[PDB]
Structure 1
Amino acid sequence: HKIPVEADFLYAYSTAPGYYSWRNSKDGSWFIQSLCAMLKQYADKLEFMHILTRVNRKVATEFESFSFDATFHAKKQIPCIVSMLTKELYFY
């Protein structure tokens, strides 16, 4: 009969609520870098959610900040998938 007006949205945030998002001056942001890698490798095999979960692992495990400034040094980041989707999504 009807669907919520807020249905069928996906919000792929680069970072958890409340938090900085990290960008590297030569390779781009941690999130966009990891998202594009994952898409290139998996968009023909994996559903979107599962691509994004691999994005979460990559940002979480492969990146750590480096800064001459102690307060910004050795910091981590976890992206935040926010799904109001009602179906699975395959670019395949």
Structure 2
Amino acid sequence: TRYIPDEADFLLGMATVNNCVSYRNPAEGTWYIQSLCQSLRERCPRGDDILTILTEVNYEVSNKDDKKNMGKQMPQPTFTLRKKLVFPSD
């Protein structure tokens, strides 16, 4: 039989890079999760893979700002995926 690494086939979607804050709008939800869900719902029906979708999440969350602290948020995926990951809607 074939063997692959013990830690293969993981995708870790972090709301933020290390050392930094992520944001929650109490009236809407978090920048990261709300962006993630919007991108999944729009792009999964089109057959887009999860890394493409998470790149869009990076783009969208990068354009948001905290005007009180002049803050930004940078999400950050990490992966040991060995194949394309798609979530078909059908």
Fold-level match, TM-score > 0.5? yes
Alignment-derived partner of residue 86 in structure 2: 90
Work out whether 1:50 is the aligned partner of 2:46. Answer: no
Q: Which runs of 5+ in 2 are unaligned?
A: none
The sequence identity of aligned pairs, in percent, is: 37
Q: Which runs of 5+ in 1 are unaligned?
A: 68-72
- Letter aligned with residue 76 of structure 1: K
Deviations along 1:16-54, one digit per CA (max 9) or x if unpaired, are 111111111111111001001101110122111000100
TM-score by length of 1: 0.88
Match of 1:76 among 64, 67, 72: 72
TM-score by length of 2: 0.90
**Residue correspondences, number:** 86
Q: Provide the aligned C-alpha RMSD in A.
A: 0.9
